[PDB]
Amino acid sequence: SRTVITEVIATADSQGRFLNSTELQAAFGRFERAVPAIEAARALTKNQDALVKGAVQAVFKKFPYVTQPGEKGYGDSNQAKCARDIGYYLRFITYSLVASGTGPLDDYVIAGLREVNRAFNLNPLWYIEALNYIKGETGKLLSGQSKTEALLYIDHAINALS
Amino acid sequence: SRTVITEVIATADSQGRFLNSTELQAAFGRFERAVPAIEAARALTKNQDALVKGAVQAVFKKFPYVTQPGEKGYGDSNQAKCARDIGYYLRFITYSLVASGTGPLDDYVIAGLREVNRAFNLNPLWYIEALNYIKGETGKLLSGQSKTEALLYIDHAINALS
Amino acid sequence: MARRMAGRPVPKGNPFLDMARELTDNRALTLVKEFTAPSPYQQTETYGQERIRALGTIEAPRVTLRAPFTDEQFQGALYAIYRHIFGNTYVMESERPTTAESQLKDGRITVRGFIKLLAKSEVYRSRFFQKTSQNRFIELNHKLLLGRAPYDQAEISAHLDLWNTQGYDAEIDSYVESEEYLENFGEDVIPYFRGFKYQTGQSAQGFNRLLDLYGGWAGSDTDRNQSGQVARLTNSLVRPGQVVEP
Amino acid sequence: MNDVFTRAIAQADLKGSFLLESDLDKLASFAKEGVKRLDAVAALTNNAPAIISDAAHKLFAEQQELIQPGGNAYPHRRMAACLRDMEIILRYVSYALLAGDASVLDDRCLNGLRETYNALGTPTQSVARAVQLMKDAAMVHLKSTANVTVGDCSSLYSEAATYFDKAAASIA
Amino acid sequence: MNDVFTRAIAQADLKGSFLLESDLDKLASFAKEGVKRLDAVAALTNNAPAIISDAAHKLFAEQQELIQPGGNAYPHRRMAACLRDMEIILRYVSYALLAGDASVLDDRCLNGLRETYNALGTPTQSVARAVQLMKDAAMVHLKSTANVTVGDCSSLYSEAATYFDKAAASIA
Amino acid sequence: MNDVFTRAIAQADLKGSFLLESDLDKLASFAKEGVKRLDAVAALTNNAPAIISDAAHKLFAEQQELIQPGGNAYPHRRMAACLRDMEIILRYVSYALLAGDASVLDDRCLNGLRETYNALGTPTQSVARAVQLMKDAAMVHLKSTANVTVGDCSSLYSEAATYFDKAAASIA
């Protein structure tokens, strides 16, 4: 993955050197901030189902034609598969909160995202709106710095989609 | 640009030797396929306004929501630039017909397509269905070798969009 | 009365009622649970990369050296170059070419030119050329200068003829000056093992051959082995699929 | 690699003799009927994304086990790898179709895919299933007499089926 | 490579679920002990030459045969190999102590090291002895309480020790 | 490359003295207010695609010839490259904002960018106007006190404005 710790270790290894004070400073900052990020992760994991269902409904509201019969969104399977995709995204946001870096997001979601979306005719705008709704609701759920870290990761995923 | 004789020249200039028999006869086949190419380009050329208006209206027909207000398709200026976009695709298909190669296409439209589309949120489905409408019209306008050759460039651009 | 208002009687004893219940009662939620359950064979994100030895090499960052590099970009670039080009072999401080490094630091030669000079250096010869057959030399040249294993026997034939006819310097220049090296790496990028991903135009066997050549992140192409740096792909290249016993 | 002409030439050379009248007639027949071969290859190339989409849809509906988390094609990158593999195999079958000989297929494409997939851990059986799904989804486009002169192309359908089956049997 | 966070994340993804509450508690506790682990890493890295030289002295006083002509440390070249191998192993052990997870060792440091030492004729028993000696020499520097606030760290000592034994047993 | 801290260090080294307590005070003040700087640069990074799309929309609204055939960004490829350029220079402006020094932008590109656009035929004053548009689009998000702690950041606005202004002038 690409955490702070792992990026530190990899950049030290590539240069073939030990970890001098700068990488340890970065690691210290990461360990100091682990508490707010884990707090955000536990808040997102607590309000999991509500966030997923709200995101799906927001996607439908901004994309009414997607609900039309004989089309991509219509069908119980495609509703369930929307819910599954948003669950995946939220899972990986919590993963990146815990790992205090966009490691899991880049590894799973973003890596290869563009061409698999192209090969399935999945509009990125759907997931962009879902993530915008999750951002809006986590504004309500999370107060303080957990809010900031979460919003950083949701915005990173949004940038990757857009 | 990368046309048939251009491919010949470029591949031969890589090595020391001149144009040997095989690429001479490849240029041959290109020349005796030019006549169908040029006349089919004429046929597809004589119908700018009809083709562009028909494809524009077909796109609006299959995707009626863009014509609704608040969508990126709504707007007289948006319709005008829709028309110029389809005219651009048509003129570059004509160019490729004349050049007996996708050179003009890959130079003008394919090169840097996806980045621009994501920049302005344009959907490849709009243009691909417009090209499908042109597929339909060329199904009548053109006969035999002209028809097949023109359909090749049209659906090559279709694959490029997709 | 109310029971009969429900509808006309349905005959009892249908064998499909268990399937009807599954299809009816919240098919969406059951579908979500079916979708998000774990698969029978558990595979992590990097399962294939770890079952292959080369997990860490793929994760290794690409290194670049542009003209206004200050200090530690240069120091890291030198270590990366010396680690990759010399096949993870130990290079003592006496053998390190200081003049080529000075030229690189001034910017007279790009990173690619420095790579070319190292390939023509005495360390590269004394390790890979002078102690091995020509097959092993070609394989090492491919793996180090180009990052990929050889694709077929035509490469060995062409490179052996080119060496025999024009010398070691021309042999090495055919690698660095090639269009493939300039496409993948260009002037300012240190070469990396790019064969572990699918490379455009590669053969089916190239991945397996690079696996044979790699031998772990620790392992290296010494020539200090008790075997003496023998070739690895002599029979894999000319007879790709088959296996024979004399 | 070989086309049919080069294969016949190589056999005639190993026998050390000129090309017979029979072999010349077979190659002339191949050349005369090569136009339909061009049409078949054009059908394969113009509809490649559609063929891959149908094959992947039917494979992952047939096998929810792959896309399912922990499975192979799950992590949203291995899925792109799967689609790319479909691309490569279809491309090589189209090459072997234009050539008229399966030499490109079994030389450039599928000598080591068996052991490559065993090393990477992917289930080769699902890959073969995916390849024959590509075969089925490609035959409907190959048979499509839309906008193409009507004729007889049974031999070409058989050839394409044999190439897809060869690829599936090798990878399986 | 994986630290403890990425390790737990990979397990959670395999289960296709979020991170359980207990796992979040464990990771929060791990990050609470972050500063202790940082001092341990600083002790390893700052005192790396001292540890390496002490371990080398003890190793060659133990096995005088390595430095005899004909032994496997005789000329300056393979003695530089001695010192640089020990440096790399200490480097990767400090890495694993920082990341909390021994994955960096297995992936990179000890990847093909058995095969290297078996092809090179290097006595792997001597390398294991050198690494264990390095353990004994570095525990002194980790246990050094000078210039740091006092606090129990038996978990960190056990972690560093098990990483050194992992390296030894993967070499031996 | 250089930042404000290394700039002060380098000038002190050039004069050869120890660091003055006054310059220490400026660097401490920079480190105290740098938390605001992090929010500023995070705003830039998060809003980057929206900012560059806003810049493109405003430019092509106010300017027309770049669209028509014969215009510098006319072919679809060339305007893709145009967007790439504007996002690249925004990224370098984010670098400059984070570092507090302009070196990493100027010394890296601005010496050669002018002549490159001159030789390429690209109208440079148009590029400067694009920089200005993208600067105002960024200022929209940088004055945005929403979703963050409230404070005063006029000095950071001045620094971002001068970075964009300097980049625009140096392109010209």
Ligand SMILES: CCC1=C(C)/C(=C/C2=NC(=C\c3[nH]c(/C=C4/NC(=O)[C@H](C)[C@H]4CC)c(C)c3CCC(=O)O)/C(CCC(=O)O)=C2C)NC1=O
């Ligand atoms: C080199 C050849 C070439 C291509 C291919 C091209 C496509 C293209 N269309 C654009 C704008 C656009 N074009 C459209 C038209 C779309 N919405 C309509 O309803 C249709 C469904 C659909 C067209 C089929 C729209 C909505 C915009 C957005 C600009 C705006 O907001 O006014 C733009 C951005 C600048 C502009 O032209 O105004 C490009 C580059 N331009 C080129 O120079």
Ligand SMILES: CCC1=C(C)/C(=C/C2=NC(=C\c3[nH]c(/C=C4\NC(=O)[C@H](C)[C@H]4CC)c(C)c3CCC(=O)O)/C(CCC(=O)O)=C2C)NC1=O
């Ligand atoms: C590792 C992380 C991961 C992600 C992110 C992921 C996304 C993803 N969603 C898929 C299916 C899908 N995804 C959607 C999109 C949703 N359905 C609609 O209700 C909504 C409008 C919309 C979301 C807002 C649809 C419609 C499908 C069905 C595609 C098909 O079978 O044709 C597929 C194709 C695999 C399949 O056929 O099941 C992928 C790869 N998969 C992953 O393994």
Ligand SMILES: CCC1=C(C)/C(=C/C2=NC(=C\c3[nH]c(/C=C4\NC(=O)[C@H](C)[C@H]4CC)c(C)c3CCC(=O)O)/C(CCC(=O)O)=C2C)NC1=O
């Ligand atoms: C020129 C001929 C040629 C081919 C075709 C080829 C295939 C190939 N497949 C690969 C991995 C892969 N291939 C697949 C696809 C398979 N696994 C799933 O089960 C699917 C059902 C199935 C697709 C039909 C997947 C998922 C991976 C990733 C394996 C991993 O990362 O662990 C790789 C490793 C590089 C990469 O991951 O991009 C290669 C080289 N190599 C060649 O030289």
Ligand SMILES: CCC1=C(C)/C(=C/C2=NC(=C\c3[nH]c(/C=C4\NC(=O)[C@H](C)[C@H]4CC)c(C)c3CCC(=O)O)/C(CCC(=O)O)=C2C)NC1=O
């Ligand atoms: C091919 C043969 C060759 C020559 C001719 C050569 C000269 C040379 N000296 C350099 C730097 C330097 N050279 C010097 C030495 C000079 N400055 C002091 O006044 C000294 C009194 C005086 C010594 C005669 C210094 C101090 C630098 C550092 C300049 C800097 O880093 O900015 C550089 C740029 C970086 C480097 O290579 O280290 C070159 C190319 N280098 C070569 O490889």
Ligand SMILES: CCC1=C(C)/C(=C/C2=NC(=C\c3[nH]c(/C=C4\NC(=O)[C@H](C)[C@H]4CC)c(C)c3CCC(=O)O)/C(CCC(=O)O)=C2C)NC1=O
């Ligand atoms: C520098 C050390 C070195 C040498 C010399 C070497 C020899 C060598 N001989 C080869 C093929 C060959 N070798 C021979 C020679 C034999 N066949 C005839 O019947 C004769 C009885 C006999 C020669 C007296 C032939 C005819 C070939 C061609 C086979 C082919 O091209 O497939 C090849 C592979 C293809 C090529 O190079 O064109 C090598 C590498 N390999 C090395 O690493």
Ligand SMILES: CCC1=C(C)/C(=C/C2=NC(=C\c3[nH]c(/C=C4\NC(=O)[C@H](C)[C@H]4CC)c(C)c3CCC(=O)O)/C(CCC(=O)O)=C2C)NC1=O
């Ligand atoms: C550069 C691309 C290109 C291609 C591919 C091409 C093929 C091609 N197909 C032709 C007719 C034909 N095409 C076909 C093949 C079709 N008939 C069968 O029903 C199948 C549905 C299907 C193939 C599977 C047949 C059978 C003919 C008539 C020739 C004959 O009697 O066999 C002809 C003769 C004149 C014409 O109709 O255009 C050509 C040159 N020409 C080109 O310029």
Ligand SMILES: CCC1=C(C)/C(=C/C2=NC(=C\c3[nH]c(/C=C4\NC(=O)[C@H](C)[C@H]4CC)c(C)c3CCC(=O)O)/C(CCC(=O)O)=C2C)NC1=O
């Ligand atoms: C075949 C090439 C080769 C050489 C040349 C060589 C020299 C050599 N001498 C060594 C030890 C030593 N060498 C000396 C000798 C120094 N102190 C004495 O008083 C003198 C002032 C001075 C000698 C002129 C000492 C004291 C040590 C022990 C250092 C220690 O263990 O701390 C060591 C470190 C390992 C050991 O021997 O215990 C080497 C490598 N070894 C080799 O394999």
Ligand SMILES: CCC1=C(C)/C(=C/C2=NC(=C\c3[nH]c(/C=C4\NC(=O)[C@H](C)[C@H]4CC)c(C)c3CCC(=O)O)/C(CCC(=O)O)=C2C)NC1=O
């Ligand atoms: C993943 C990081 C990494 C590791 C772990 C590593 C170990 C390593 N040690 C090596 C050589 C060696 N290493 C040793 C060290 C041992 N011999 C024993 O007697 C002593 C206990 C000890 C001496 C310090 C020796 C003697 C050689 C042989 C050098 C030669 O024969 O030239 C080599 C082969 C280098 C070559 O072929 O020249 C490797 C790969 N290399 C790496 O890049």
Ligand SMILES: CCC1=C(C)/C(=C/C2=NC(=C\c3[nH]c(/C=C4\NC(=O)[C@H](C)[C@H]4CC)c(C)c3CCC(=O)O)/C(CCC(=O)O)=C2C)NC1=O
């Ligand atoms: C970036 C470089 C950097 C490092 C490495 C660093 C270490 C560090 N050590 C700390 C305290 C501490 N440091 C240690 C570690 C030592 N205590 C001894 O007992 C052990 C022998 C030994 C550990 C093996 C301990 C135990 C604490 C107190 C924490 C506690 O008792 O839970 C603290 C918290 C503030 C304090 O109370 O002093 C930090 C940040 N700070 C930095 O800026």
Ligand SMILES: CCC1=C(C)/C(=C/C2=NC(=C\c3[nH]c(/C=C4\NC(=O)[C@H](C)[C@H]4CC)c(C)c3CCC(=O)O)/C(CCC(=O)O)=C2C)NC1=O
């Ligand atoms: C990483 C630092 C970096 C920068 C900054 C940079 C600028 C740059 N932009 C270029 C092309 C271009 N740049 C532009 C943009 C200009 N034309 C109009 O659209 C606008 C008014 C204006 C942008 C707002 C265009 C249209 C091209 C295409 C011209 C061509 O390809 O010939 C080129 C020529 C080579 C290429 O990119 O293909 C360079 C060097 N290059 C770099 O490596």
Ligand SMILES: CCC1=C(C)/C(=C/C2=NC(=C\c3[nH]c(/C=C4\NC(=O)[C@H](C)[C@H]4CC)c(C)c3CCC(=O)O)/C(CCC(=O)O)=C2C)NC1=O
């Ligand atoms: C994970 C990355 C990261 C970020 C993003 C970060 C931002 C950050 N902003 C803070 C407060 C602040 N943030 C801002 C900046 C905003 N306030 C508005 O007025 C301006 C329009 C706007 C500037 C663009 C200001 C002015 C403060 C108050 C600082 C003070 O007390 O002087 C604080 C102090 C603690 C808190 O408020 O909870 C932090 C840590 N820290 C991080 O570790």
